[PDB]
Structure formats: C-alpha cells, structure tokens
Amino acid sequence: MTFKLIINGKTLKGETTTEAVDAATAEKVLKQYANDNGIDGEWTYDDATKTFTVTE
C-alpha cells in the first residue's frame, strides 16, 4: 500500500511517498523525513483517504 505525505508548510511545503503495510509502518519513515527538515506541528492522519497531513 502506497502512502502520501502532506507537509503544509507556510514557509516550505513538500510531499513524499513510501511503501508500507500499515499507517504506522509508513508514518515511521514519513515522520523521519519531515523531522529531518526541522518540521514540527499539527500531525494529522486519515484512515478513509489513507493520507497524512501536517499543518505547520
């Protein structure tokens, strides 16, 4: 299952995808991708659309 990351950055926006089996499996790599760029804020997750969005 392919996931999609949504980094709603007012100063710097971006996105990335990673192959995973569960929302927790992908979030593990996704959360690291954002954090690596000094990104931190309101982390949200959707089970219906299966997409993650972070409102900085």
From Swiss-Prot:
Sequence repeats lie at residues 2-56. It is found in: Secreted, Cell wall. Transmembrane segments: none annotated. This is Immunoglobulin G-binding protein G. It comes from Streptococcus sp. group G. The lineage of its organism: Bacteria, Bacillati, Bacillota, Bacilli, Lactobacillales.
